[PDB]
């Protein structure tokens with residue numbers, strides 16, 4: 285079973301799953317302290333419901349919201365929009381790139397307890413449990429980020445829940461993440477190295493895939509997008525279809541960036557979270573990729589990844 | 596004009612009584628108490644500790660505390676309301692920003708920040724209806740560009756609503772002089788501003804010069820030191836004729852996550868009196884050095900009341 289914001293589901297219920305998405309990119313406490321920044325909480329929720337309904341009509345059945353504490357995750361909002369759009373949402377623990385002081389000063393042992401409580405007990409007082417652990421690094425990995433990665437590995441080893449990462453692919457950041465995870469005894473099959481579509485260095489991706497890591501080609505419309513999409517085909521052609529995860533990395537509201545960035549983004553990708561099913565899938569089909577392989581990438585791979593496993 | 600917002604609603608300035616103008620229920624980070632209450636043992640344990648502590652402060656004469664925890668210090672106004680009601684002590688809540696703004700704050704303009712502070716003063720904090728009665732700002736050494744936006748936004752909010760501004764400084768950096776310059780460039784009256792953490796210095800020339808301009812001087816961290824040296828600064832400002840410019844506090848807290856683990860237990864074994872330190876240890880010390888009872892009531896009652904009353908607009 286996979287934990288979602290509406291409770292547990294069987295792996296067969298997950299269906300076509302976008303593995304790296306956000307309802308809202310924000311900061312801890314921000315949505316509740318200043319909802320007017322998004323027009324209103326209601327306006328944000330309604331936009332997300334329409335957006336999720338549009339993705340559902342394009343075949344999407346589940347999204348993984350990889351918003352951590354410090355991205356302002358509001359699981360109550362996730363549960364509301366999930367119920368109204370009839371789209372499953374898996375919530376995340378972990379930490380991204382904006383930890384406040386109360387996180388930054390914690391030891392690896394303390395961070396492990398925090399990630400564990402969000403997986404095993406629930407997020408805040410909601411009873412909603414995280415189904416994935418999201419971490420992020422820059423450069424060669426800062427000392428704090430190393431603590432985060434180790435705590436994520438320890439939480440994953442105790443629960444079977446997978447780890448997914450933010451990298452700078454241009455700096456081949458997955459290599460240092462992989463080294464830390466393997467030092468902790470974490471199986472690569474529990475790890476998605478994310479934002480991997482932001483490089484043209486195929487040798488970097490193939491080597492990670494050959495070690496058993498999942499490759500998150502998760503930011504396709506942030507681009508040319510066809511060039512990014514072709515990395516999918518390249519990994520298929522090398523026989524690493526089982527290692528591929530695809531997503532949009534879209535959002536319905538953003539406060540952790542310049543004002544009005546959401547409008548720019550929406551104008552550049554009007555499909556929003558429907559961009560993968562509406563544009564990328566047809567493109568890959570037009571390039572000769574068969575249905576069975578596209579369904580394995582978008583249904584089978586996410587199911588294997590999210591299903592809690594210690595084998 | 597004569598009413599101030601507290602976490603239990605509007606009150607008249609007569610009810611504030613003995614007021615500690617820089618305190619905290621909990622020193623934390625946005626969202627942190629709600630996401631990780633076990634860090635404090637539990638939310639209930641933290642509330643109970645605050646209630647026990649505030650009740651000793653009430654016994655010793657405290658009627659009002661100003662919790663200057665901002666959004667980014669993890670202010671939880673619902674917690675403040677719960678402990679204020681159970682301890683039966685007035686708590687004034689703060690808006691503003693301290694030293695740990697998240698990206699969603701750090702990327703905002705002065706106009707946006709002004710709107711945020713105005714929302715917390717004029718409409719309420721989150722969905723609680725509880726309005727802030729003071730604006731808390733913080734700078735480090737030289738004001739950074741973002742801190743200057745925060746100070747201007749604070750000045751603009753203060754001028755639109757009349758609520759005062761209270762600052763965090765490094766007094767060993769004379770931080771108040773650069774904060775004052777910004778505030779005055781915005782047309783903000785020094786009588787609306789408390790330059791806080793001013794007891795951490797020995798530079799009486801710095802303190803007296805700010806007082807002479809009409810600023811409130813926040814001698815707000817007495818028990819953090821010897822404390823006697825810090826307390827004697829109150830007397831020094833009295834002796835120079837600036838009784839009406841002094842504000843005294845403990846800058847205490849009942850839980851702390853914005854520091855290394857176990858700092859709370861060390862602070863508590865150092866100052867067992869908590870927020871009762873001012874009324875219990877410092878007030879008799881000053882009277883012992885010969886300061887009239889009436890001067891001390893002016894400092895602990897009249898000075899905060901004039902400070903907190905929304906003034907001008």
Ligand SMILES: C[As](C)(=O)[O-]
Pocket residue numbers: 309450533
């Ligand atoms: C741009 As992101 C790290 O919020 O997916």
Ligand SMILES: C[As](C)(=O)[O-]
Pocket residue numbers: 619622763846
């Ligand atoms: C508790 As503080 C560091 O604003 O004095």
Ligand SMILES: [Zn+2]
Pocket residue numbers: 420450451479
């Ligand atoms: Zn990312």
Ligand SMILES: [Zn+2]
Pocket residue numbers: 304305306350533
């Ligand atoms: Zn993302």
Ligand SMILES: [Zn+2]
Pocket residue numbers: 762763764792
């Ligand atoms: Zn301070």
Ligand SMILES: [Zn+2]
Pocket residue numbers: 617618619663846
């Ligand atoms: Zn303080």
